[model samples]
Target: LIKKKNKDIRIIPLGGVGEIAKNMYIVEVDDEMFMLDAGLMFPEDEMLGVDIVIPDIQYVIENKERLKGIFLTAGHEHAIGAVSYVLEQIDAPVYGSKLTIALVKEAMKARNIKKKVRYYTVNHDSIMRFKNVNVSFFNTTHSIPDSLGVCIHTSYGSIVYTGEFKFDQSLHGHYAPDLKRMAEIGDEGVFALISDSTEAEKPGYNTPENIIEHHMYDAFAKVKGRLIVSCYASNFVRIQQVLNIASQLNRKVSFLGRSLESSFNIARKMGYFDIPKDLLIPINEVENYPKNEVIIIATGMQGEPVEALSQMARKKHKIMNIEEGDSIFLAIASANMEVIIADTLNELVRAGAHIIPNNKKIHASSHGCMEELKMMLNIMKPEYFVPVQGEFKMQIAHAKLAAETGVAPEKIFLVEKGDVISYNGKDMILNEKVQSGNILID
Candidate 1:
């Protein structure tokens, strides 16, 4: 059933080539085409009045009907949130695993989008075939739970897409590269490989999420007042881990951000949450809990102006009160690449909150380090490599690693948000540029 003939596959980057934000990709086989993901980019502070940045989706607009659907590798905003922006334009069914679609549906609702978002449940251990392409999902952990790596079996050969992955093995999460399956997939013959370059610059492999537990426990043990933690709402795994710590200490947990609360509720309803019922304490019942036994999970780790944590930092969120020596445990789930961690911490410190960060813990990252990326490459061994989900430097760093690891220069392609690469049965090549970027609505 698996043959190497009539295998023509074209790969395009509508976004997420050389950038950590705004991710989009198009995979084509003969006349039939499939898209990997559609994501948005967070606006920089200098953007002035921008709402959000998303992939243009103009390239696929003309071929929307031919496009089988948009498949997501994870639930991150960059990989799934932009669907509401272009769903009407392409009008194609948006597909992903259960958690991915659940988050995307929430994003669509935020935009007041009434379009139905269809989901194709793809578990870490699930595999399916669409026409000539064999699609498989592997359990790949990141900052968020339910992150996946997509393997596409094309006519030319097999292709692996590592969607924003990290090689973290921890108590709250489990993510290995599925080396057994990848090894078999490699033996079958791999035509191309696309990977996430978000943390390509890091030297070693990422530390496990379980390690963050010790950090949480150690920090909480010393804090004598109410504890506050700010993390990405998409990082449900980290949230679960933090909740476990709070529950262990008999602390009542209260959510401070609206989005954070919504995400937790969604994760719970969709059966993604692993925390127990007794672990979750409602924000409305905060007055019933003692200060020493309370944990407030808020937002604005990225310094977003409108986020709840940001408001609390600026003395705006009324529900989140500050005490002179209240211990604040900021479990920075993701890398603060663009924002200054010290400056942001200072804002909270000045607000009478003592900051307890994981800077010394060395176990709070969601993106894979260089070593993990290399290990993944060794496993898949796809012919062509397209680095996605990072900035230009990040992509180039991964590209350089690919070349050093035996993938030929011709086989490695560095793309930006709108670049496209075409393949002709035997070799994959860059074709042309496509119009795709993020667009904000309301």
Candidate 2:
């Protein structure tokens, strides 16, 4: 255990600082610690053929006894995807909402990493007792459904961590933040705040998913042939929106890609997905359906070679028959990261498809913009700010935001993966650095 000036409360970062990918943080009290979100990073181009990148989990292995468990905020890989690997190294029960646990289970199955992890169900505004700390999952909207903002009440004070989020009321199903509960957490006096800084460079509030409904409807109305759209399957709300429209227009919706298909199934099974069962046409039935009355949702939005959309463009899948003027629309809701986005879109268009590029006013991230970030800070009043879940440059933007928004620059701590943050009750600082870079084994 590291000693800090505070001597009453200490916090540390195992990963997820000074970067936008792997999200892992450790909260420490008198003699106990709990990890928050064992997140993973996507492999860059030069990373060879790696599927996933995980944070260095040495800190937890060293202090397993003191660690209570791992709390995942959402179903994203950056949330509980790394639980299997971490559990193998250090045994800690994984905790999160029902959907989050399902995602983790699938992640392990996909990787063939067979390690049993204990999971608990949580929801927005729900309180959980994990060992000595009291953890609460606040309802927060993000690109993915069931995302949460974690509030941990330790011996010293309450700490808030916004794993990743945006507030949009117009999206399908439950798509709003638990502002009432967030305010209540704030009122309870938050000692520290660790919020996402990935979209910190973006300004104003994130564009609502509802804006896409108008454009999507217009695009759907004009397309003369069958429609195929690709996006993050985890964005269940968007999927529902598209599905509703498809149902209204007398079309059948089918989810392609293993990830997309699995996510859809899990959500539906858990009752988190609100799409009508009859409206969903099985993938096997795609060949029998008329091209004009089908709305296909597939993966490979990032241009991944083997994803469903990419395979269809290459005419590899026996069931997916894509031809000229079929109207394949790519809903790349993420940012315009040219190398991947442009290449993927170009491939589809070249193969006789149409591309729906992201507009700042539409397809913008489900992350908080500058104003929203500042607003969270103003209310939470966290003594320390550490920006996470973004690129190195994104971390700088996080620090800048803190300084400009009245948070002391010195108080803003930024460090990379493998970097150890030590907190001894009262004082908090970066102590020892460790490897957070992830490697794919299978």
Candidate 3:
């Protein structure tokens, strides 16, 4: 049995504090430590030859025996990408919802992770206890299914982590958040709230449902040639949206790229989305159909050189090539990959393909906006606030939002990676720094 202490709990973020990805955090309560999300970040333009970047976990490795478990909030690449890598270094049980566990299993299998791990499946109502710390999982709507936010009930008080979420009115089917639990947790009292600050600087709420659906329908109505859509492979909601549109328009659908294909198969197998078997046209059979009767969904929204859409853009894809009059939709163009996506779009234009305009109608953010963030702050009524999952300036903007929501400016802590924020039973303090950095994995 692990021994208990009377010290304050320390919260440390190894990554995703001042940056946008590789989200990893440690909650050290007494002597036992619980890890939240071991994710990976894609390399930027200047980072040459680095395949991926993961959070430095030397501190966790040093205290391996005291580590209780690694908890996951979602199946998105930024949330569970580095799970297998972290498992290789330390042995601990992993807790996640059903879909998150499924995705993590696939990631580990793809990485050839041979060692067996203790896996516990959780849901919105599941409560997991570790000594004095109890974690309650609750559903949250994101781009993917089974996205969750965890509330950690410690000896001092509660700490809520609102993992990437948004309020969508058309919250039907699998994409639904537990609004009752979210509010109840707040009513019970929250000592601190750590939330996604990705869209904190943006005004208004996030784009609502059917916006992208309407965009796809409009594009399909206007196009007479083959229709090709590129997006983040892990976005199951977008995949479902396109599938719905194609099915309604009587068009055959085919997916490209290894990750996209993998995600579709897994989501289908896990019963997250249903696609008629007949609706799927084998990629090699694309030549047999009329150009106007098919819809192709592929990966490469960021213009990765080897992904399907990029290869097609460069006339290098073996089975599928961009032809004249084809409507190519770049459904996701984030700031980090705008330049590369611009080049890819230009290449497609030179190849005679019609590029759909990149706009809000074509893509929707999964993170909540300023109004939604303020609503969450109002709902939670946390004693302290710490904005997470964005750049430094974004965090500052989120702090201002929180301040406007009536949270005292002194209670909001703007911290970066390696900085430790400690909370005792009565007071909070910025403690000594920890050793934290990113490790480039080529």
Candidate 4:
């Protein structure tokens, strides 16, 4: 049993409050502290010569002695991408689910970080006790496998952080939120709820599994040539769904892009993805088969310049090319990459390939919609609600949703990056702003 120590707890947003990426947050319980979700974001056009962007952790670096460890919720780049960089700067154990730990290890390995850092594997049910804090996790479904929500038990109260979640029961087999456990925690009285607000403006129920399955079946059945699908490699659920559809359609599937192949390999090794051995064809054997019998799954749904799909669109990929009558399906596309995706699509069109419009329900976001967001509020019923992980407008929309769900507007705080939210054993309030910004990585 763990007893709470009476101390002031401060919640600070280092990044991922006003923006959609480079998510990182700091929790200070008196002198002991920890970090949640040290992630990275893509650079925009104006960020000239920048490779990627990470949250500025100058404050964290200053308080390195008090830092306990980093707790990760998911394996997405936007959640764990900056782990290696952070580990290089500060020394602390990093804790996450099995898949998340594996992904972080790969990230560190890629950076040639040979330092033997402490890495602990945790599950949703694991409870970690430290000197000043007790950390508990609950399973939450997201775009990636092994996603979990964190609850930091401080003397002030229980601080609940939902990382990119959706109240999706249909995703039971792949991954599902532990609603019973969440409700039990709510019964224990939540101090504050920090939740993702990425899709607060979206209306109605979220996309069902059947909808995506139907859309993919329709597209695959209609296409008479090779069908190439592009999406983020972190979307393990989508990759699994695609493999299932392709196997059903008797289409031999081949993976492209180093990241895509690596992700699938990791998922397979972790026992998360299962496919018939005969259903897969080697990348070298793709051209050996008839076009109609092949389904190529590659990366670069956002039109990354050097990704496999982008290279193929530019007639530069060594193993693949955009052939005439090839149906190119973008399984993942975002507003930030609209121009790039458009240019890539145009290039495919010039190469005589058919571009599958993403307007169809071929892809669904991992974030929760309005109803689902409201459902979370009803389930947790936190005393204070702080919406994180979206643009300012999206966060405002989420605050509004929380009000509509019967939470008092006064209890909702719509904060931006660098803001400090504090709880002094009784009430939660926003105090002076802190140093928070993005750092360009090249």
Candidate 5:
């Protein structure tokens, strides 16, 4: 056992402390533990040949006997990216929404994982009662639908984990946070609050998805050619917005990339979005329709070498090719892909396509800004606050925002990987460190 008292609870961050990716957080009560999420990060410049970077699950490996299950927040790469790798070592059930569960199963297939890992589909009202800890989830409106925020109700109080979220009222159905339930969860009393710090540097509320729809409608009116757009495959909400605009503009949609088609098919089969049956057309059928009446939605918004956008840029794609004067819109661009995205833009321009690189204004971020972070702090009124899911600078910004919402600085944990917040039945303190690092996978 890691602790002498069964009442002692340890909140240990395996990777998602100061960095933006490889997010795996742990909550231990008694001798049993459950994970919040297990994700992987993309390789950077320092890594030459590595394919992906995952958390050093060594600590989890050592305590494998005590693990109960892994609770996933969403199907994003930053949440369940490492599930296949983790399941390769230990056997534990996974619990998430239907879409997320399907995503996990699909990820396993990608890795050729033949071993059976039981998956449970959870909803907002679902509750998982364990030996010492009871778990529940709340809806969170993010970039993806069926996103959730986890709560571990222990004897101390509810440990709320808000994996990247915004208080976006514009979202509906499974795309919006259950604010009423969240308020009640807060009123019940909270011990700690772990929230997304990705957009903490921003000052105001996050931009809503409808704004993108309005902008895209305006842009579609200006363009007189076939519209080609690139976005992250994980962002089905953004994809839904683009599809809505395409239909409203009397333009049919065609998916160019394999990942784009697969992700859409998965989302569609599960009833995630009610897209019209006539809204989509096969790539071969694109030539039958007028150029101005078609919109090609492709992958590779992150400027990867093999994705559809890069292939179209380099004239290497087998089926679809970029045409002159094609109105290409890159709808998503993260900070790390700046250099590569620039190179892609140059290539697209060289192909005679009119480039409108408006990712920042086109796709609204799912992470809440500083004001929204403060608003969550005000509601939860957590005795302790831990800013998570961003770089160190954003975490620092989130810490200050927490202080502004009446949480004392002493109760705020500005931590790094391996840092442990140990809570006994009565008091909590930062305890001894554990092994925490990355496990580079080729």
Candidate 6:
């Protein structure tokens, strides 16, 4: 048993507070702790010899005795991507939605790991009764489906983590947002609120991904040749748009990337996708179909060299080569990869392909923008706030957004991964910093 009493609650970030990727947050009540998102960040190009960057779970490992579980919010690279690594180290049970667990299973197998994880499949309505803290989830719209936010209820009040959400209700199916439930939770009184700040600097709400269908439909109607599209495999919402466009334009669709193929199969079996039986064709059989009647979806919108789109650009892909009338579109582009994207475009041009710009915004962000962040504050209405999941400037901007949304200036706390914010039965204040770091892996 923990020496500490059951009345005190503490919030600490082992990673992803004041950081962009690799999210891990510790919500400890009376020394019984559960974490949020065992995330991993892909290596920067300059970080030589590194495969990926994971959080230093030394803090978590040090206190493993009190650890109860790890909650994966979504199946994103920066959310549940490092679950395998975490599972290898700890015996704690993992909790997430169907999508999250499926994706984690895929990752573990891909890496050839032998550990059999203890997985618990949870949904929006599921709640767990713990010794000191009660846990539950609420649906939120992100690039991926089955995304859920966390609420840890304690004897004092609740601690809420709005995991990478936006205020978009139009994202139907598993991407639905439960605003009414969020408001009802607010009625119970929240002690502290932690939220994402990735797009806090951007003004207004982000474009809902559903609108991408209309733009893609317009573009699809004009294409007279095979359409080669590139997007993130985990972005199932955008993938749904592409599939919808293919169905509407009467084009047979085939996916190319290994990861995309895995996601497609998993989401399909999980009932997240509802493709007609005859709509899909195999990648090798693309040559048999009329050029304009086929839609080839591949990975690597950021221009990564090993991905399918890049291989096709260099005429290195085994199944297909760039042709004169081939129409190419990138449905995804990260901000830092402009130079790489530019290079890939020239390669495609050299290969004699017609480039179709995503000028109509085919991909919407997974994070909430300024107005949406404010909307969360207005809804949660917590007494204390912590701005997370971004650089210092973005978090600062979120703090301003919180203040503008009527949360008092004094109630907002801006702290880094190791810093502690403690909420006793009544007052909340900063505590001593703990050991924290990033661990690079091969």
RMSD of each candidate?
3.1, 3.7, 2.7, 2.5, 3.2, 3.2
Model 2 alpha-carbon drift over 4 Å, by segment: 1-15, 106-116, 124-132, 171-173, 300-307, 316-322, 333-338, 423-427
Q: Give per-residue CA lDDT, model 4, range 163-269, as digits (tens).
A: 88886666875487788999988888787898988889888666876577677787778899999988778877778788888888889998877677776788887
Q: 3 or 5, which is superior by TM-score? A: 3
User: Global lDDT of each model?
Assistant: 0.72, 0.71, 0.82, 0.82, 0.82, 0.81
Task: Work out the TM-score per prediction.
Answer: 0.89, 0.87, 0.94, 0.93, 0.91, 0.89
Write candidate 5's Cα lDDT for 227-258 as tens digits: 88877678787788778988788999988765
Report the C-alpha lDDT of model 1 over 162-236, residue by residue, as the tens digit.
Answer: 788777555334434566776888788888888888778888877676666666687788888888787767777
Which 10-residue window in model 2 sums to the lowest lDDT? Answer: 300-309
Candidate 1, residue 173: CA error in Å?
Answer: 7.1
User: RMSD in Å for candidate 6, one decimal?
Assistant: 3.2
Q: Residue 137 of candidate 2: its Cα lDDT?
A: 79
lDDT of 6 by residue, 19-98 (tens): 67778888899869888898876555446776678887877889999999999999887787678888888878889998
User: Candidate 4: where is the Cα deviation over 4 Å?
Assistant: 1-4, 300-308, 333-335, 359-363
Please write out the lDDT profile of model 2 over residues 186-281, one tens digit for every residue.
Answer: 787876788888788876777666777777787787777778886667767668778878877888888776667777778888887667668887
Model 4: lowest-lDDT 10 consecutive positions: 300-309
lDDT for position 164 in model 4: 86
Two-way lDDT contest, 2 vs 5, winner: 5
lDDT string for model 3 (131-179, tens) is 8688998888888888889898865568888888888877665688888
Candidate 1, after superposition: displacement of residue 283 in Å? 2.1
The clash count of every prediction, one per candidate, is 17, 15, 0, 0, 0, 0
Model 6, C-alpha of 202: deviation from truth (Å): 2.1
* Candidate 2 vs 3: which has more lDDT: 3
TM-score (C-alpha, index-matched) for candidate 4:
0.93
